[PDB]
Amino acid sequence: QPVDTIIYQAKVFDGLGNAPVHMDVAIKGQQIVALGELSAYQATEEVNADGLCLAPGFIDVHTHDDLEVLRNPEMAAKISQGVTTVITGNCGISAAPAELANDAPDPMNLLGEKAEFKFAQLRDYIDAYKVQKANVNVAALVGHTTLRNNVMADLLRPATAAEITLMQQQLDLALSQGALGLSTGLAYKNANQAPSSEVHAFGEVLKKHDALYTTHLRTEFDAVLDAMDEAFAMEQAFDIKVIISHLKCAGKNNWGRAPELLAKFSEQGEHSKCSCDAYPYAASSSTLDLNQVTDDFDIFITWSDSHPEMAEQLLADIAKQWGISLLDAAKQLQPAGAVYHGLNEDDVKTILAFDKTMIGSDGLPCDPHPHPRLWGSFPRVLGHYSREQGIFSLATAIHKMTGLSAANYRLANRGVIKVGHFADLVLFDADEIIDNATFVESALPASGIHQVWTNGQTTFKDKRVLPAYSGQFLTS
Ligand SMILES: [Zn+2]
């Protein structure tokens, strides 16, 4: 009857949005084994959490960490924020099941270089993960654009009916091997010509596996509401769980339209289970897209293969030095990465406050000067938006990165501090927790996190990332 660890006298948040409770938490093996008051229990290790808070480990529902978790199993960018589980395979791109011919078509470079895609089937990817495991648990979506690339040489078109049949069987096999569902990125060049009927062709497979559908909307600018109708039609037709990724209304035309996005959820019809996620910043980030170049707001170049000397500079400054328009400068900078300061802060606050919204970092792990969301998202929610701005309580903030997310993705026995659940846990100081990553110094680690456990083993303690490698692959 001894346990490995008891955490004494933390302010414990259960992850369900309830008021915190002062009590002790016992860990043995991978599991939370006792809650309440455990001075009469025998523990090898005793942690004094007086004055601190304990919460379930944070679940990053929107990552591009597919290959990063193999390259970098310590996962400092996420672990130092309190993240214990990552959801991979978003916006239509995944590491598996993928077989590459010529190149990795865009946006697969967000994941890694062509040579890294060594996983013809999902089980190859799970095998690779299990060589070292990682400091985070992994749950994987299958990317629709990745599936298209397996069967299409020319991506600038709808898939044929026969190519769709192949993709249906590839998704079915991947789901049987453990994938959670399918993601799309319908705004990207290499998926934009997929009609809604092509996406609908996956619905029966998803429904048969009780699997998920996540989507980067076909547009997030003027016609964003039309794009949301597309996502709801998947829920209407198949009664499956749908999640809209990084909800936003982008572009100067659309600042102030966040209430329209919220109200659009009233058009779901029969089922009302569509969810969404967001990152806590008023700026987006992706490979430089000529269609988004504007003088309406700041655009910052993060990398450029053509002109690396212009990295970490404002597009308007680059254009002035070069003596040409912003659009012509962008043409010469490609291929390049950018941070677009194209969102409105009041819109962001409304979308974060929305009770359907989970927290997702959308961190880009191959970016050499990344958007700071890669390193600051979850402490920014707890410290900036909860404590400082007062948009919501700490209990609400925690719920939106733990229990809400485990429920929506059906992650068994995670996201909640309850006896019998896994001991993914974060110990932190509520008054000091804060993001330090800025747009200029975008990899500064957060403050206020004292200790992190993944499946009962310490992966972070007193500013040290620790290679416990106790994460697991979470199969459906
Ligand atoms: Zn996206």
Residue 366 in tokens: 């191959």
Residue 138 in tokens: 């992994």
Distance 247 CA to ligand 1 centre (A): 10
Asked, for residue 305, whether it belongs to a domain, the answer is yes
Distance 11 CA to ligand 1 centre (A): 36
- For this PDB entry, the determination method is X-ray
**Beta carbons within 8 Å of 55's beta carbon, 6+ residues apart:** 12, 13, 15, 82, 398, 402, 417, 425, 426, 428
Asked, for residue 253, whether it belongs to a domain, the answer is yes
**Resolution of the deposited coordinates, in angstroms?**
1.8
Distance 95 CA to ligand 1 centre (A): 16
Distance 475 CA to ligand 1 centre (A): 23
Q: Quick one: 292 and 272 in the same domain?
A: no
Asked, for residue 52, whether it belongs to a domain, the answer is no
Q: What is the C-alpha to C-alpha distance for residues 127 and 370, in angstroms, rounded to an integer?
A: 29
Domain extent for 238: 57-282+342-412
Distance 367 CA to ligand 1 centre (A): 15
Asked, for residue 94, whether it belongs to a domain, the answer is yes
Backbone dihedral angles phi then psi of residue 308, each to the nearest 5 degrees: -60, -20
User: Which residue shows structure tokens 């806590």?
Assistant: 280
Residue 274 in tokens: 């569509």
Backbone dihedral angles phi then psi of residue 77, each to the nearest 5 degrees: -55, -40
Residue 135 in tokens: 């400091």
Distance 91 CA to ligand 1 centre (A): 5
Q: Quick one: 315 and 203 in the same domain?
A: no
Distance 29 CA to ligand 1 centre (A): 37
Q: Quick one: 322 and 377 in the same domain?
A: no
Backbone dihedral angles phi then psi of residue 177, each to the nearest 5 degrees: -85, -5
Distance 92 CA to ligand 1 centre (A): 8
Q: Quick one: 312 and 208 in the same domain?
A: no
Q: Which of 20, 94, 17 is nearest to 401 (CA)?
A: 17
Residue 375 and residue 446 in contact, taking contact as beta carbons nearer than 8 Å: yes
Residue 285 and residue 340 in contact, taking contact as beta carbons nearer than 8 Å: yes
CATH number (domain holding residue 196): 3.20.20.140
- Boundary (domain end) residue, out of 341, 356, 390: 341
- Boundary (domain end) residue, out of 393, 412, 431: 412
Distance 245 CA to ligand 1 centre (A): 7
Distance 82 CA to ligand 1 centre (A): 23
- Boundary (domain end) residue, out of 412, 427, 453: 412
Distance 335 CA to ligand 1 centre (A): 18
| Amino acid residing at 37 | E
Residue 368 in tokens: 């050499």
Q: Quick one: 171 and 311 in the same domain?
A: no
Residue 202 in tokens: 């996956």
Distance 214 CA to ligand 1 centre (A): 10
Distance 404 CA to ligand 1 centre (A): 21
Structural domain total, the chain = 2
Distance 216 CA to ligand 1 centre (A): 5
Q: Quick one: 326 and 183 in the same domain?
A: no
Residue 93 in tokens: 């791109």
Q: What is the C-alpha to C-alpha distance for residues 166 and 99, in angstroms, rounded to an integer?
A: 14
Distance 340 CA to ligand 1 centre (A): 13
Q: Quick one: 179 and 193 in the same domain?
A: yes
Distance 140 CA to ligand 1 centre (A): 16
Work out the burial of residue 86: count CB atoms within 10 Å of its CB; fewer than 13 is exposed, 13-18 middle, 19 or more buried. Answer: buried
Q: What is the C-alpha to C-alpha distance for residues 32 and 321, in angstroms, rounded to an integer?
A: 59
Distance 285 CA to ligand 1 centre (A): 9
Asked, for residue 372, whether it belongs to a domain, the answer is yes
Distance 109 CA to ligand 1 centre (A): 13
Residue 426 and residue 57 in contact, taking contact as beta carbons nearer than 8 Å: yes
CATH number (domain holding residue 327): 3.30.1490.130
Q: Quick one: 71 and 216 in the same domain?
A: yes
Q: Quick one: 93 and 190 in the same domain?
A: yes
Q: Quick one: 328 and 346 in the same domain?
A: no
Distance 469 CA to ligand 1 centre (A): 28
Compute the C-alpha angle 114/119/120, nearest 5°. Answer: 105
C-alpha separations of 288 from 52, 282, 315, 319, 356 in Å: 42, 17, 11, 15, 30
Q: Which of 281, 268, 275 is nearest to 245 (CA)?
A: 275
Distance 16 CA to ligand 1 centre (A): 28
Q: Quick one: 306 and 237 in the same domain?
A: no
Distance 311 CA to ligand 1 centre (A): 22
Residue 464 in tokens: 């040290």
Distance 93 CA to ligand 1 centre (A): 9
Asked, for residue 255, whether it belongs to a domain, the answer is yes
HEC secondary structure over the chain: CCEEEEEEEEEECCCCCCCCEEEEEEEECCEEEEEECCCCCCEEEEEECCCCEEEECEEECCCCCCCHHHHCCCCHHHHCCCEEEEEECCCCCCCCCCCCCCCCCCCHHHCCCHHHCCCCCHHHHHHHHHHHCCCCEEEECEEHHHHHHHHCCCCCCCCCHHHHHHHHHHHHHHHHCCCCEEEEECCCCCCCCCCHHHHHCCHHHHHHCCCEEEEECCCCCCCHHHHHHHHHHHHHHHCCEEEECCCCCCCHHHCCCHHHHHHHHHHCCCCCCCEEEECCCCCEEEECCHHHCCCCCCEEEEEECCCHHHCCEEHHHHHHHHCCCHHHHHHHHCCEEEEECCCCHHHHHHHHHCCCEEECCCCCCCCCCCCCHHHHHHHHHHHHHHHHCCCCCHHHHHHCCCHHHHHHCCCCCCCCCCCCCECCEEEECCCCCECCCCCCCCCCCCECEEEEEECCEEEEECCEECCCCCCCECCC
Q: Quick one: 304 and 357 in the same domain?
A: no
Asked, for residue 465, whether it belongs to a domain, the answer is no
Pairing of strands 3-12, 21-28: antiparallel
**Beta carbons within 8 Å of 161's beta carbon, 6+ residues apart:** none
Distance 41 CA to ligand 1 centre (A): 48
Distance 432 CA to ligand 1 centre (A): 31
Distance 203 CA to ligand 1 centre (A): 21
Distance 116 CA to ligand 1 centre (A): 21
Asked, for residue 474, whether it belongs to a domain, the answer is no
